[PDB]
Amino acid sequence: SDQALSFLKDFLAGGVAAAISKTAVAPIERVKLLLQVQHASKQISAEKQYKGIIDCVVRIPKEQGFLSFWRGNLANVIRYFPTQALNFAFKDKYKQIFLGGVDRHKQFWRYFAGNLASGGAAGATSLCFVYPLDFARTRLAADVGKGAAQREFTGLGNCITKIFKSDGLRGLYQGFNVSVQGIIIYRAAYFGVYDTAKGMLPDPKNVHIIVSWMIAQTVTAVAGLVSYPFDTVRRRMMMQSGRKGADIMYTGTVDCWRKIAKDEGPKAFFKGAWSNVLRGMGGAFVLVLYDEI
Numbered sequence: 001s002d003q004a005l006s007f008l009k010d011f012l013a014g015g016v017a018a019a020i021s022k023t024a025v026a027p028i029e030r031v032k033l034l035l036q037v038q039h040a041s042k043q044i045s046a047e048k049q050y051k052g053i054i055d056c057v058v059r060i061p062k063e064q065g066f067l068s069f070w071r072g073n074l075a076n077v078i079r080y081f082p083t084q085a086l087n088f089a090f091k092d093k094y095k096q097i098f099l100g101g102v103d104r105h106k107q108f109w110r111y112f113a114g115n116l117a118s119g120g121a122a123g124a125t126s127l128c129f130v131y132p133l134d135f136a137r138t139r140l141a142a143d144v145g146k147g148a149a150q151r152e153f154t155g156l157g158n159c160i161t162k163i164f165k166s167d168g169l170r171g172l173y174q175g176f177n178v179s180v181q182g183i184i185i186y187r188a189a190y191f192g193v194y195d196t197a198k199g200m201l202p203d204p205k206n207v208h209i210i211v212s213w214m215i216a217q218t219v220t221a222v223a224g225l226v227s228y229p230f231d232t233v234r235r236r237m238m239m240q241s242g243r244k245g246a247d248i249m250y251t252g253t254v255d256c257w258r259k260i261a262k263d264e265g266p267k268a269f270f271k272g273a274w275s276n277v278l279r280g281m282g283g284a285f286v287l288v289l290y291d292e293i
């Protein structure tokens, strides 16, 4: 060996691992979505909206079947491979266009900005292609329907083809913009918090290693909380595609930040935020157990 098809078995493993953690936490990921976008559903009346996580998981199995926890999951397992291909293709290029020729230690802010753009551009590129999967994934999760007769979509494939035959690609991509704003916010917080933090803590390796994990998670959760409102409006807009007239609670991104803060208050933006913290730590934790011989 020295060129034994090495580069791709990682790819397979990397995707197989991704599939496993996503599927493991798919149940809580669905509860977080429901709580997040239920207030804007055609199915969930006001007298069906869940009181929280427990209320939700205690009711879902009975309402739609135990397997419904995995409703919309398929897209989670797919997305990995197509996304990854696109990174091998642009991520590096973006790094050099924006971070090229700048020394992180002698230009902190020019590195902060360049790195945002670097991640912002790449994210926008990948989204551009797999966004639809996130769309379907989110639409299906919100499908609180019971039988295939009280179900908005009979699946991912249908969900895609349906909305399209209803709004072309425009429907399938609602929330795009704000999700791109969100990504930059996520990244600014992720790093912003890791820089201030790297100093407030002992970097001489002296800090067990497991404590190092819990802090990485801590940082992933903080970053995820700061950009959560953006995720919230993003999802709320996805909900609209296909809903021709009447119920249209939102018309545009601004129309969304608007209605919410008004009708739902200053926090509706964080509906599912805690659930999303659990989903994230749970996932990172699954990747831990996964590393078995």
Ligand SMILES: C=C1[C@@H]2CC[C@H]3[C@]4(C)C[C@H](O[C@H]5O[C@H](CO)[C@@H](OS(=O)(=O)O)[C@H](OS(=O)(=O)O)[C@H]5OC(=O)CC(C)C)CC(C(=O)O)(C(=O)O)[C@H]4CC[C@]3(C2)[C@H]1O
Pocket: 083, 087, 091, 119, 122, 123, 124, 126, 127, 130, 178, 179, 180, 181, 182, 183, 184, 186, 187, 190, 224, 227, 228, 229, 230, 231, 232, 234
């Ligand atoms: C408005 C919002 C909220 C805040 C920002 C994003 C993410 C958290 C942002 C995030 O993940 C991004 O952040 C990572 C941390 O800095 C960055 O890694 S890094 O380069 O190694 O630093 C990831 O890049 S990648 O190159 O590895 O692939 C990047 O992924 C993308 O660009 C994924 C595309 C599918 C978009 C990805 C993701 C996740 O972690 O849950 C994912 O979908 O998998 C998004 C969920 C959707 C929201 C939630 C978007 O709705």
